[PDB]
């Protein structure tokens, strides 16, 4: 039934913690953060420009 | 030393000046059938030059090229190993390699294989991008 087929695992689903976008999720460190969404919230995390 | 200017064996005139391993490369796929150096264990000195070869050495060299298990050289040094139609690990050499590409192509054509159509219509299998750099002279091919 739809129950037995809905979302059968096919792949890992990885989304920015802030925006939920699959593209450019970023796994470099624990930060699963959108590449575009990162820049907006970099300051609260404290990542800073040299 | 007594030398043979051109060594006619294997349908390839073999130059006498070249070193034995390098001259033997000119014999179709052989000369590399020994990975470029397996006659050294089987019979001849590894680097004596092609014309320094002697009748006894020539007979010995041909026997090991003909028989892989004569000196028990492994299938890793050999060419076709599973063999679709032979079930044998024999190295394919001389006229047989020229026959084998055509022979395999007949199988690639007989089974309606996706590879086979590309082979007959002279295209490339995979190669990733096949539109941009495939072209050789106003045509890929």
């Amino acid at each position: 039934m739809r129950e037995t087929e809905f979302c059968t695992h096919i792949a890992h689903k990885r989304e920015c913690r802030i925006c939920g976008n699959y593209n450019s999720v970023y796994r470099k460190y624990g930060l699963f953060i959108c590449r575009r969404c990162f820049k907006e919230n970099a300051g609260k995390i404290g990542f800073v420009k040299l | 030393n007594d030398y043979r200017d051109l060594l006619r064996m294997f349908n390839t005139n073999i130059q006498g000046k070249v070193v034995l391993e390098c001259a033997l490369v000119g014999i179709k796929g052989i000369g590399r059938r020994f990975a470029n150096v397996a006659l050294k264990k089987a019979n001849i000195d590894v680097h004596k030059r092609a014309g320094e070869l002697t009748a006894a050495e020539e007979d010995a060299l041909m026997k090991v090229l003909e028989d892989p298990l004569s000196h028990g050289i492994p299938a890793w040094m050999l060419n076709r190993n599973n063999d679709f139609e032979s079930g044998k690990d024999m190295h394919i050499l001389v006229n047989t390699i020229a026959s084998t590409h055509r022979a395999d192509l007949e199988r690639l054509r007989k089974t309606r294989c996706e590879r086979g159509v590309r082979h007959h219509h002279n295209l490339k299998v995979r190669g990733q991008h096949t539109k941009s750099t495939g072209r050789r002279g106003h045509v890929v091919g």
Binding site: - | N82, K88, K110, T111, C113, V117
Partner: protein
């Protein structure tokens, strides 16, 4: 006519496990090293039902979306239609076809058809 040194008919009467020692490196990994799926096994279930046990020699067709299926010698001289993503493509499985993927023998592209 010989396949892997057998006369030719010798291959037909064989389970995949029987011909597995004499197989290509890749088809050892999928059949034995990693095993097969139950829906893929259901394809074999559909074919034992549709085998010589199936009534009549007239075609029973059989259309499968499944593409990555190394063919067993049980399918020698069998014809079925496999999806290219748009059309199920009839292909004659045969002793040469065995030991290779079913996906390649059906074709999805357009053969280029260029020169426009």
């Amino acid at each position: 006519p010989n396949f892997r040194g057998v006369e030719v008919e010798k291959l037909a009467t064989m389970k995949i496990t029987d011909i597995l020692p004499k197989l290509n490196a890749r088809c050892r990994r999928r059949i034995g090293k990693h095993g097969l799926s139950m829906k893929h096994l259901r394809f074999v279930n559909k074919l034992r039902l549709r085998r010589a046990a199936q009534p009549s020699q007239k075609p029973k067709i059989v259309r499968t979306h499944l593409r990555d299926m190394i063919i067993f010698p049980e399918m020698i001289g069998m014809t079925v239609s496999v999806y290219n993503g748009r059309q199920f493509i009839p292909v004659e499985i045969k002793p040469p076809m065995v030991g290779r993927a079913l996906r390649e023998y059906s074709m999805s592209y357009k053969i280029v058809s260029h020169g426009k």
